[PDB]
């Protein structure tokens, strides 16, 4: 109504007085934005943006400094309004226009690529100060489901490479200040979402265009950007993390933080500390094992072995891992770690007994995923067939009665020597105990498990079982395969 008329009067325009009046109106709008939060606001923001653009295109102590002061006041008002859907998008567009005008008109000398640091720090402080109830403490998935911060990270931080370096430099400079570092540590879901966006400048598979027309040494040193990212990751992982947040941080460390880290000693120490973490909570008990996969990244990075890695892998396998959605990664890690030629037969037998118990207490998907590992172990280890078939208990038609009597006497005193409570895989006597639990899983309702059991019962034709195709399997996947 009146806002549109004011915008039209400002656009039609003694133009300095009109611009000052428009700035005052924008300030009044930003002041009443609190009550607004408690269509005209978007129009006022658009009018303010248009006035700022006109002032930047025209003006450059009462003609140059006055316009600059008005622009700074408008920017501060916008930052205060953003800190305290359509309004957020309008504020983001106004901030982008102000950044473009600062990089294009606020420079003293034309030709030198310079970017503002006070305005960027003020915008970062205004964006980081905003906190919502539905953003932090994500229960289903993610770390921070924001509306303005996520849109800015996906539309502006994911499109420019110099913007990411500028944000890293602003966070490193803000880490020296105690209040800004405390604000960054309190809002750790925003940094987690920025890291999980996977749009950093260190990634070579994706290229980002230059936001400003003149890049201010954006590719001068990637080592400085890597060091800033490592410092930000070290400062943001000091504390104030939930169990789901810790699991997300471990997944990011094993997925897309180790490749962006300059010094991996701190990351390896954090992964080793998290892999040994265990509490009475049932949710956190599987939090360390995936972090152990990050320790496997250390096994692919440094020549440092974890203490009792085989014992930790044996004690980390439980029914909670088979009932979790991250069972595929744990199964892949167990299959990869068992591919070494230095593994003994007692540890292999104990792992086979543990997998048999896990398949005895799980759904059909976990048993189908673990059947290929057992088949690969039987193909690779010929002694494991001794756990499958016992020739001393066999009977032949062309045999003497004394041998049959001895076999009957041996079978009459047959016991199970395997110990399930024994954490040491070598000390577990699963080699002398038969794998009876495989026979209990043969009679299953699903036909794929029955086909896998029938293939395992017969002789092995090919060594490569192609376990990658039968790795991702669930109830919905099995239902879709059966129905289609």
């Amino acid at each position: 109504m009146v806002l549109l008329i004011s915008e039209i009067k400002d656009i039609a325009k003694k133009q300095y007085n009109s611009i000052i009046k428009l700035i005052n109106e924008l300030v009044i709008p930003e002041n009443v934005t609190q009550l607004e939060e408690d269509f005209l606001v978007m129009s006022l923001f658009q009018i303010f943006r248009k006035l700022f653009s006109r002032g930047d295109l025209t003006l450059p102590k009462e003609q140059f400094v006055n316009w600059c002061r008005k622009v700074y006041e408008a920017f501060k008002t916008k930052l205060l309004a953003i800190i305290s859907t359509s309004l957020g998008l309008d504020s983001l567009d106004v901030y982008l226009q102000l950044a473009e005008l600062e990089s294009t008109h606020f420079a003293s000398e034309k030709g030198a690529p310079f970017f503002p640091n006070k305005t960027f720090r003020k915008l970062i402080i205004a964006l980081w100060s905003s906190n919502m109830g539905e953003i932090e403490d994500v229960k289903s998935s993610g770390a921070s489901e924001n509306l303005i911060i996520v849109e800015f990270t996906e539309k502006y931080y994911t499109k420019f490479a110099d913007i990411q370096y500028y944000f890293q430099s602003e966070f490193n400079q803000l880490l020296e200040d105690p209040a800004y570092q405390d604000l960054l540590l309190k809002n750790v879901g925003k940094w987690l979402a920025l890291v999980n966006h996977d749009k950093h400048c260190s990634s070579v598979d994706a290229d980002l265009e230059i936001f400003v027309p003149n890049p201010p040494q954006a590719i001068e040193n990637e080592s400085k950007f890597k060091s800033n990212f490592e410092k930000n990751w070290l400062s943001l992982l000091n504390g104030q993390l939930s169990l789901q947040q810790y699991k997300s941080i471990l997944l990011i460390l094993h997925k897309r933080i180790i490749p962006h880290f300059h010094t991996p000693t701190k990351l390896m120490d954090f992964l080793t500390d998290s892999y040994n973490l265990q509490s009475s909570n049932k949710n956190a008990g599987v939090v360390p094992i995936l972090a152990l996969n990050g320790l496997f990244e250390l096994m692919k990075r440094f020549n440092l072995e974890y203490p009792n890695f085989y014992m930790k892998l044996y004690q980390i396998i439980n029914p909670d891992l088979m009932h979790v959605k991250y069972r595929a990664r744990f199964f892949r890690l167990m299959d990869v770690f068992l591919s070494s030629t230095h593994l003994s037969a007692h540890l292999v037998a104990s792992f086979i007994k543990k997998l048999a118990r896990l398949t005895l207490e799980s759904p059909p998907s976990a048993i189908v995923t673990v059947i290929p590992f057992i088949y690969n172990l039987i193909r690779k280890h010929p002694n494991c067939m001794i756990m499958l078939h016992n020739p001393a208990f066999i009977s032949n038609p062309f045999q003497t009665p004394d041998q049959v009597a001895n076999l009957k006497t041996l079978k009459e005193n047959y016991v199970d020597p395997f110990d399930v409570h024994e954490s040491d895989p070598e000390l577990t006597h699963a080699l002398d105990s038969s794998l009876w639990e495989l026979a209990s899983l043969m009679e299953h309702y699903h036909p794929n498990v029955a086909t896998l059991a029938k293939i395992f019962a017969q002789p092995f034709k090919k060594l490569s079982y192609n376990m990658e195709d039968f790795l991702d399997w669930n109830y919905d996947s099995l239902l879709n395969a059966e129905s289609s």
Partner: protein, 323 residues
Amino acid sequence: ELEQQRLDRMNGRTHDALLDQVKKHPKIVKNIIKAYQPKEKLGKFTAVLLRHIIFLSNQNYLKNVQSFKRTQNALISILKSLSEKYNRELSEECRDYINEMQARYKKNHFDALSNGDLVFFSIIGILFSTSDQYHLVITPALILMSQFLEQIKFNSLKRIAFGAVLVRIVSQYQRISKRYIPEVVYFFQKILLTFIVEPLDFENIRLDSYELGLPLDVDFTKKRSTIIPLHTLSTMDTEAHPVDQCVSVLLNVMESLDATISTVWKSLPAFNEIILPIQQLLSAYTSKYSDFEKPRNILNKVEKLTKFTEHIPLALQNHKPVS
């Protein structure tokens, strides 16, 4: 010939809404409509009758046995009368119902679950050949039941009653099949740990809630309540979980576990190994109140099964020459 066919399978009017509105003595009207149709229309009438029966089962069960169970039996007989002549349309309707149930389970965890799903599963088991191993309707229903038993959690008496009804339906469907189900054993272990949560012996069972329990306050004598199968009535009154109701649910779960052990798990010696902790949990029941009679009988049956089994070995993989 029918037994041989079962063994071989083991080894190897228009709109539904309009019909439901017209029905809302419905069984007699449905029978009259079916007779008038029989005097694609028959398949549409059968689908509409099945939808009306499912709506009546999942809507309310406030009427008694002689007022609601008689009408349900009449509707089931009317549906089974056209089930022998129409099987492809019935299989397509069962597949569509299974897909709708899967979509409801994917959309909501327990809010989209209704009390008519158990009745629909029982009707599908009764109508179709339950002895069939690979079937277009039986296999998907069993897979969906196993997924619901292994994916859902227990936090109230309604979840425990639904799990007991699902275990009973799985035992009835596998009464002729006699197949081993690790999901059923896992559900029984979870029900035993949830009623004994009130613990340190079983830590990998991953119990959902520790708020559920079973105190030693019920006599569990011969005057105790029976199973009394009424899914709507039990689920709608499970907010007030009584000691008598929880004791009846625990006794029904123990009886179902004993029936599955003596009818399905008695043919596997390795299941005795799978009965190593659970009977110990029953021994924990023997250490819980030391007054129940079903736990002592279950322990005696487990001991007899362990003593009868030799627990030796079983292998094969042989070969020879050729012609």
